[PDB]
Amino acid sequence: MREIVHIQAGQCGNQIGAKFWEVISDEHGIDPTGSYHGDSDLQLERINVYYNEATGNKYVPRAILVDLEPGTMDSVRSGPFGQIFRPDNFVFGQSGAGNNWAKGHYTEGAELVDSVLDVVRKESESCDCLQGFQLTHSLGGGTGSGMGTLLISKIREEYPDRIMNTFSVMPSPKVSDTVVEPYNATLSVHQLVENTDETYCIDNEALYDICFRTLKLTTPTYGDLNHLVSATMSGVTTCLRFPGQLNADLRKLAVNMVPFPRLHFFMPGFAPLTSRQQYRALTVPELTQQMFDSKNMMAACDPRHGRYLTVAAIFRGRMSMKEVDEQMLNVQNKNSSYFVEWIPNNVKTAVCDIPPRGLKMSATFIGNSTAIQELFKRISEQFTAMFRRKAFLHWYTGEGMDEMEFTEAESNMNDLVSEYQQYQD
Amino acid sequence: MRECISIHVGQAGVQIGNACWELYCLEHGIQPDGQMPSDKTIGGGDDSFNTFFSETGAGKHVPRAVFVDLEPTVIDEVRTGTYRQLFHPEQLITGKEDAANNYARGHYTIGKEIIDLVLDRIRKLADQCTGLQGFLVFHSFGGGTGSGFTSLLMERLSVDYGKKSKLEFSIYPAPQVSTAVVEPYNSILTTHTTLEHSDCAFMVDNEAIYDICRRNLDIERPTYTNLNRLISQIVSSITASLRFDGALNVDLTEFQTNLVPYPRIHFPLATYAPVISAEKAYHEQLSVAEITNACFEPANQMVKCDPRHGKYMACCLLYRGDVVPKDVNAAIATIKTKRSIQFVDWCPTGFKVGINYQPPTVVPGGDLAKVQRAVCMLSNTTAIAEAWARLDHKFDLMYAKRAFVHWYVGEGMEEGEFSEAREDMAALEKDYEEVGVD
Amino acid sequence: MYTFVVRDENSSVYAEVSRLLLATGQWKRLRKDNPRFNLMLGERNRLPFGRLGHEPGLVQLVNYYRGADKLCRKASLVKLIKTSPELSESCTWFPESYVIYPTNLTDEREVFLAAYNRRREGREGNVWIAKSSAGAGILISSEASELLDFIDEQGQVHVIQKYLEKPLLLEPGHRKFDIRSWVLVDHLYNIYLYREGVLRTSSEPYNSANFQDKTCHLTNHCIQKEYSKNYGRYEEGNEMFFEEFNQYLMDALNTTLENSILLQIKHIIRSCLMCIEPAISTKHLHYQSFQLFGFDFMVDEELKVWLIEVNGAPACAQKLYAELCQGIVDVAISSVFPLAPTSIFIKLHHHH
Amino acid sequence: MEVIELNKCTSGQSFEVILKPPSDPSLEEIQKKLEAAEERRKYQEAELLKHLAE
Numbered sequence A: 001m002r003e004i005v006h007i008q009a010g011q012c013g014n015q016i017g018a019k020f021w022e023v024i025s026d027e028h029g030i031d032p033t034g035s036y037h038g039d040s041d042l043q044l045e046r047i048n049v050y051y052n053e054a055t056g057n058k059y060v061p062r063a064i065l066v067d068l069e070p071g072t073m074d075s076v077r078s079g080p081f082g083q084i085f086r087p088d089n090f091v092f093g094q095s096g097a098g099n100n101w102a103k104g105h106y107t108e109g110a111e112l113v114d115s116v117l118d119v120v121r122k123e124s125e126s127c128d129c130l131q132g133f134q135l136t137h138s139l140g141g142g143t144g145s146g147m148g149t150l151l152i153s154k155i156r157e158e159y160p161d162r163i164m165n166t167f168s169v170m171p172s173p174k175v176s177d178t179v180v181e182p183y184n185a186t187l188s189v190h191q192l193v194e195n196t197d198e199t200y201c202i203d204n205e206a207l208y209d210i211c212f213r214t215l216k217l218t219t220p221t222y223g224d225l226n227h228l229v230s231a232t233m234s235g236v237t238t239c240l241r242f243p244g245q246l247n248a249d250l251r252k253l254a255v256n257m258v259p260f261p262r263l264h265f266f267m268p269g270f271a272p273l274t275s276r277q278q279y280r281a282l283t284v285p286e287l288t289q290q291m292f293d294s295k296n297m298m299a300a301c302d303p304r305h306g307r308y309l310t311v312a313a314i315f316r317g318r319m320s321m322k323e324v325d326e327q328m329l330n331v332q333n334k335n336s337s338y339f340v341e342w343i344p345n346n347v348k349t350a351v352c353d354i355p356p357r358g359l360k361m362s363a364t365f366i367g368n369s370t371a372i373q374e375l376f377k378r379i380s381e382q383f384t385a386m387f388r389r390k391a392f393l394h395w396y397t398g399e400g401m402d403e404m405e406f407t408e409a410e411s412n413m414n415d416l417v418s419e420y421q422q423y424q425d
Numbered sequence B: 001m002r003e004c005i006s007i008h009v010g011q012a013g014v015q016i017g018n019a020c021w022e023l024y025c026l027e028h029g030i031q032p033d034g035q036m037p038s039d040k041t042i043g044g045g046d047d048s049f050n051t052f053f054s055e056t057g058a059g060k061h062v063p064r065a066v067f068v069d070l071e072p073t074v075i076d077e078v079r080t081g082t083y084r085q086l087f088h089p090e091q092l093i094t095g096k097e098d099a100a101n102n103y104a105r106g107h108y109t110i111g112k113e114i115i116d117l118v119l120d121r122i123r124k125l126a127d128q129c130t131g132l133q134g135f136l137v138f139h140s141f142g143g144g145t146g147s148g149f150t151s152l153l154m155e156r157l158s159v160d161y162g163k164k165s166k167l168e169f170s171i172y173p174a175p176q177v178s179t180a181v182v183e184p185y186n187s188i189l190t191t192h193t194t195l196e197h198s199d200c201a202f203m204v205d206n207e208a209i210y211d212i213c214r215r216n217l218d219i220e221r222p223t224y225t226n227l228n229r230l231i232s233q234i235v236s237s238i239t240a241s242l243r244f245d246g247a248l249n250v251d252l253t254e255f256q257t258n259l260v261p262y263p264r265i266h267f268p269l270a271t272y273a274p275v276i277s278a279e280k281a282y283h284e285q286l287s288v289a290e291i292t293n294a295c296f297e298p299a300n301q302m303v304k305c306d307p308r309h310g311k312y313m314a315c316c317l318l319y320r321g322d323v324v325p326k327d328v329n330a331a332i333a334t335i336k337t338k339r340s341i342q343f344v345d346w347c348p349t350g351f352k353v354g355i356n357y358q359p360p361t362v363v364p365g366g367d368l369a370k371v372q373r374a375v376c377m378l379s380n381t382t383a384i385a386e387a388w389a390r391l392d393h394k395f396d397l398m399y400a401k402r403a404f405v406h407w408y409v410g411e412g413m414e415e416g417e418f419s420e421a422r423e424d425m426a427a428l429e430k431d432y433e434e435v436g437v438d
Numbered sequence C: 001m002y003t004f005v006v007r008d009e010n011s012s013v014y015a016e017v018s019r020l021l022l023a024t025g026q027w028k029r030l031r032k033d034n035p036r037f038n039l040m041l042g043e044r045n046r047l048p049f050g051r052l053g054h055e056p057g058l059v060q061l062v063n064y065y066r067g068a069d070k071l072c073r074k075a076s077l078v079k080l081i082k083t084s085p086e087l088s089e090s091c092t093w094f095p096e097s098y099v100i101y102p103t104n105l106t107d108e109r110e111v112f113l114a115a116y117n118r119r120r121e122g123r124e125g126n127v128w129i130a131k132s133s134a135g136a137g138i139l140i141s142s143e144a145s146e147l148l149d150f151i152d153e154q155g156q157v158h159v160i161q162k163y164l165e166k167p168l169l170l171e172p173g174h175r176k177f178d179i180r181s182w183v184l185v186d187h188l189y190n191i192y193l194y195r196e197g198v199l200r201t202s203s204e205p206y207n208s209a210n211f212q213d214k215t216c217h218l219t220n221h222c223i224q225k226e227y228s229k230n231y232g233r234y235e236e237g238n239e240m241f242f243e244e245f246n247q248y249l250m251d252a253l254n255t256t257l258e259n260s261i262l263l264q265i266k267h268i269i270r271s272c273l274m275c276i277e278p279a280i281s282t283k284h285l286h287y288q289s290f291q292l293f294g295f296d297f298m299v300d301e302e303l304k305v306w307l308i309e310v311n312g313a314p315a316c317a318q319k320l321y322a323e324l325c326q327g328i329v330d331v332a333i334s335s336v337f338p339l340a341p342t343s344i345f346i347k348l349h350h351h352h
Numbered sequence D: 001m002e003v004i005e006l007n008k009c010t011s012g013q014s015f016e017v018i019l020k021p022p023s024d025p026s027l028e029e030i031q032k033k034l035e036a037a038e039e040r041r042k043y044q045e046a047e048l049l050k051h052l053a054e
C-alpha cells in the first residue's frame, strides 16, 4: 500500500493530467464513474497507488487539480472522465497568471497555495504509506510553472523525506504561446534542480516533430501532443501500477537512476510510433531499435551527443523475455561508447504482461543522459537573448521581482549545463 | 540436543527461507499444519530434528525461525501461504517501507527503529532452547535490508549471544536477476561490518544458480521460484548433519572447526551434483565416482571460479542416498590422479565424508528429478577470492566518481565508511593471495 | 558486430591481429577498461582472469591460458618436468636441469653438485649454463664454483642445465643455431603447429674452448645484432627459414627437416601441452582461452632435438607476421566468433 | 590413503580420509554509531528547513 499523490497545475498540466488519468483508468478497468469493469486481477493488484477506494467499490483518482483560472478545469469536469475526480480536489482561482512566473510564484499563486496544501495534506493523511508526489505541469506558462514550483517548495517543507516527481513540459519557440516562455522555464528549472528527485523532461518541439514527421500529422494540435504524453506517462509509471520487483517504488527508482542529486532530469521515450501500416506486428528487435532512436525520444536531445548515466527500459505485452534480454544486451554491446563505463550494468530492463490499449506490445524508455544539457542550453540562449536587453522584464518587476533574481537563475542553469559537461567526458 | 535458530532478512532471505522450510518439512515428514505422525514423542523430545523444530502440546512442529522484512509484501505470502499454519504471527516481522536498496537506510535510518523488536522476537525463540547452538542467517548482498539490516542484527547478536555461533547464507549479486545499480556498494558495505561477526558464510552467486537452471533444467528464463528451490536443496544438504543422526557437522561449532582454519577466510565454496531436469524422459542414474568427479567441475559450483588455480584448506563430502564408504574412497583415488587439487602446506591433504542414506527429497511438481544418490562438496579454496575481486572492481568504478554516494550520506552514513569498508576488502583479497599463490 | 579490447600495447603479434580484426569491418575495438567485450588481448602479467565470463549474453574469449606460466618459466618448466609423471625426470629430450635459489633467500643445489662431481670423475664433458627469466644475464662455465657463485650475486632464481657441447653446426661458418616454432592452442585444445619456423643462427664460428665470449654460443637475435661482427653475413638477419634449412639437410646430410628434426619437435610439443591440459583447459569454463607459444629447440651433431624453453608471449619473424597473425584470426578468434587453404597449420591429434 | 574416525549409525556413516600429511563493539558503542547517524540526518534536515525558511 505505497500511495502516490498526484497534482496537476495550470492549463498544460491539467490537460495532460486529464488524458493521463483517462489512459490509465482504462488499463485498470476503471470506467468514468469510478466503477471497476476489468477482467484481470493484475488490474487491481496495485490499484491503490493512484486511486482511493470509496463506498460501493468505487475508485477515485488520488489527484489534486490546481489552476489560477477556472477555464481549463471546467473542461476537465465536463470532459469524459471529469465525473471521476473528487469534487473537493478542484482548487482554482479567478485572476489567472498571464503566462507570468511571478504571478504564479509570488502574488496570485501565493494567495491560493495554502488552500491547495489543505487538500494535499488531506489526501496524504489518509495514506497507509505515502511514497511521494508526482506533478504534471508546463514550465513555460504562469500557473504550472510559477505556482507549480511554489507548491513543490512548500510540499518538500512539509514532507521533506518523500520523493518529489514531476512531468515537466519544456517550451520551444517552434510550439510557443508567448515570447516569455524562456523566462518562466529558466526560473522553474532552478526550482526543480533543488526540490525534485525525478523530472521527466518533455520538449514540445519533440512532440510536434514526432506528430509531424513520424506520425504524419499535417497540422498537429495540443491534443495530438498530449496523446503522446499520455502514452509516455502510462509507460514510465508501469513499474508503479503493476506487479513487479524492478523500480517498484519511487525511491528505489531514484536510487537507481540518480547517481548525483542535481542530475535527475530524464529523457522519456516510446515505441512503437506508427502513423495510420498500423496493423503490422512489431518484433522485439524492432521495438528495441526504435525505443533507442532519438526520433522516438521526447526531450529533443540527440543521445548520440552525450552519454547515458542510467537507463530503465520497460517492455509491455506477452513476448519472449529471453528475446528481450538478447536485444537489450545487443544495443548495449553494439553502442557501449554512449554508456558511461564507470557505472556497471547501468541499463536495467523490466517486463509487464498487460500491454497498453491498442497494442500487442510496446516499450517505454527512461534515460538519464548527459545530452539533456542541450535542452537547458537552448533555454539559456533564448533567455540571454532577451534578458541582455531586459526585454519583457516589466511584467516581472511589476509583480515584485528584481533583475538580480533573473541573473541568479541564469547562473544556476549554466552551472547545471557545466555539471552535465564534466560527466560527459 | 541443541537448538538452531534461523533468521531470514529481506526479500531474498524470506523467499529462500520459505523454500528451505518447505523442504525441511518434506524431509522430516511434517505436514503443512505442523503435524508429524512419525514423531512418537508428542509435544517434546530431544531428537535431531528438534534442533530446527519445537513442539506444542497439540503436537505441532514449529520451525525455530524468524522472518524479517522492512516491507510486508514478501512476508504476507508466508502469512497466507501453504505453510501459513507452521508459524505464529510473532515469527513474522514486517515494516511498512523498505530500505530502497540503500545499505545506510537498512542499517541506520530504518534499522535503528526496529532492531530492538527483532531481538525481542528472537529472544522468545531462545527462551525455548535448553542449549542454543547459534543462528543461521539468510539474506542477500544487494538488498538494502539484506545488506544493511543484517549487518546490524549480527553486531547485536554478538553482544547478546556472545558465545553462540553464527553462519550465513548470502546471495551474491548477479546482473541477470538484478535491477539495482548500487548492489556492489551494499555488498562490500555489509561484508565489512559482518566479517568479524560471522563464523562461516556460504555464498551463492545468482549468476551460478541461474545458469544451472538454464543448462541442467532447460529453463529458458528462470524465476525466483526455480532459483530458490534449487538453493534450498543445497542448503538442505548443508544443514542435514544438524537435523539427522550422524557424527559429522553435528553442531554449528563443527562447521568452523572443519572448514575455517583462519577466521577471515570463512567463505567455503559449495558444489552440488547431480542436477537433473524432472521433465526428462528418464535419466541414467549417476554413480558415486561420477557425482564425486562433478564436484570439481566449475559448472555446478555455487560461485563460478577456478579451484585449479587456488589452494584448498578444507574439504567436506556430504552424500545423500545409496552410497557406501568403499565407493567414496575409490572415486577419490581416481580424482587425485586426474585432477589439480593443491592443498596448503600447513593443512593435511584429505577429505571429511558424511553419508546420509536417505536420498535427496524433491518438492512434488518442482523442476528437480528424484535421484538415488547426490553429493554436496564444501571446500575452502582461495579460488573464491575471484568473486571478491569482481565485486571490488565494480565498487572502484562507481566510487571513483562518488556516484550514488549521496543516497548513503543522506541517510546519516559518513562517506569515510565507504573507504573504510573498501580497504577491509583490499585486505581480505590480500589474505587470500598470501595463502594460495606462491 | 563483435567487440574486443586491447590491454597490451607492446604486443607486436596482437597489434597486427587487432589491425586485421578492424579491417574485417565486423570487430569494434572498445576502451581497455570496457567490460562489454567478446575478445580480450590481455596484458602479460597479472591478467584478471577472475573477471572474465561474468557478462550476461557476451561469450568472452582471452588470448592467454591461465596457468600456462608453469611451462613458460625457466624453473617452472624444470619443476614441471621432474614432477609430472607424463614427462618424468628421465625425460630424454630436455637437458638435465636443476633449480638453484641464491643463498640469500625447493632448492636443488646439492643434487646438482652430486651429478656434477660424477661427470668430473667420469672424464665426461662437464660444461653447464646458468640462466634466469630475469635476464636480458647468462654464464657458461665448466667449473661449478663459478656457476653457483654467479647466482648468489643475483637475487632471483636461476637454473643450471647441461650445456649442449655437441650442437649441430651449419656450413659454411661452423656456427651454432636454434629453432623457433610457433604453436597455437585454440579454445578446444587443438594443438596447431605453424608450418613456418625460423633458425636464429650465430654469425660467429662456434668455439668450444672459450665460453667467455658468448657471441658464438648464444643465438639470441639481439646478441648477434649487438656483439656479433658477422651479423647478416650468411643469411638475412641471422634467420634461416625452413625452405633453406631443408635444402641444407639434403645436400649435406642426405636427410630432410621432417624426418631428422620435425618429428621430434612435434613430439615435444604434444607432451608439453598435453601434460598440462587438465590444469589449463577451458572446456567447461565460463570463458574461453587460446594462446600462441614459441618453442625453442636445440639440435646436436647426432640430429637429436632438445627443448630449451617455452615463450608464452613470443614474437614472430618479420617476414611471417602477415601469414601467422591472419591464421590466428581464422582458427583461434573467428572459430569462436565467425564472420558474415591449405591451412597454414599442422594439427597434432591427441587424446583429451 | 588412510581412513580414520569411521562413525556408523542407522541413518548413515561418516569418516575422514587422508592422502598426504601437512608440511566486538559493545551495546554502548553500537548505540553511539546509530545516534551519530541520526544526528547527521537531523542536522541535514535542519539546514534544509533553514534553507526553506529563507
Ligand SMILES: Nc1nc2c(ncn2[C@@H]2O[C@H](COP(=O)(O)OP(=O)(O)OP(=O)(O)O)[C@@H](O)[C@H]2O)c(=O)[nH]1
Pocket: B009, B010, B011, B012, B013, B015, B016, B070, B098, B099, B100, B101, B102, B106, B140, B141, B142, B143, B144, B145, B146, B147, B171, B172, B173, B174, B177, B178, B179, B180, B183, B206, B224, B227, B228, B231
Ligand atoms: N536467489 C534469490 N535471490 C533473490 C531473491 N530475491 C531477491 N534476490 C536478489 O537480491 C538482490 C536484491 O535484494 P533484496 O533481497 O530483494 O532486497 P531486500 O533485502 O528486500 O532490501 P530492500 O532494499 O529493503 O528491498 C538482487 O540481487 C536479487 O537478485 C530470491 O527470492 N532468490
Ligand SMILES: Nc1ncnc2c1ncn2[C@@H]1O[C@H](COP(=O)(O)OP(=O)(O)CP(=O)(O)O)[C@@H](O)[C@H]1O
Pocket: C095, C129, C131, C135, C136, C161, C162, C163, C164, C165, C176, C177, C178, C217, C218, C219, C220, C296, C298, C308, C309, C311
Ligand atoms: N643447455 C644449453 N645448451 C646449449 N645451448 C644453450 C643451452 N641453454 C641455452 N643455450 C643457448 O641460449 C640461447 C637461448 O637462451 P634462453 O632461451 O635460455 O634465454 P632467453 O629465454 O632470454 C632467449 P629467448 O626467450 O628469446 O628464446 C640459445 O640460442 C642457445 O644456443
Ligand SMILES: Nc1nc2c(ncn2[C@@H]2O[C@H](COP(=O)(O)OP(=O)(O)O)[C@@H](O)[C@H]2O)c(=O)[nH]1
Pocket: A009, A010, A011, A012, A013, A015, A016, A097, A098, A099, A100, A138, A139, A140, A141, A142, A143, A144, A145, A169, A170, A171, A172, A175, A176, A177, A178, A181, A204, A207, A222, A223, A225, A226, A229
Ligand atoms: N504538450 C502540451 N503543451 C502545452 C499545452 N498547453 C500549453 N502548453 C505549453 O505550455 C506553455 C504554456 O503554459 P500554460 O500551461 O498554458 O500556462 P499556465 O496555465 O499558466 O500554467 C507553452 O509553452 C505551451 O506550448 C498542452 O495541452 N499540451
Ligand SMILES: O=C(NCCN1CCCC1=O)Nc1ccccc1
Pocket: A097, A098, A099
Ligand atoms: O487585463 C489586462 N491586462 C492584465 C495584465 N496582463 C497583460 C499581459 C498578460 C496580463 O496578465 N488587459 C486587458 C485587455 C483587454 C480588456 C481589459 C483588460
Ligand SMILES: [Ca+2]
Pocket: A111
Ligand atoms: Ca487578490
Ligand SMILES: [Ca+2]
Pocket: B039, B040, B041, B042, B043, B044, B045, B046, B047, B055
Ligand atoms: Ca518429539
Ligand SMILES: [Ca+2]
Pocket: B158, B162, B196, B197, D024
Ligand atoms: Ca562473536
Ligand SMILES: [Mg+2]
Pocket: A011, A012, A141, A177
Ligand atoms: Mg495557456
Ligand SMILES: [Mg+2]
Pocket: B010, B011, B071, B098, B099, B143, B145
Ligand atoms: Mg525488499
Ligand SMILES: [Mg+2]
Pocket: C311
Ligand atoms: Mg624468455
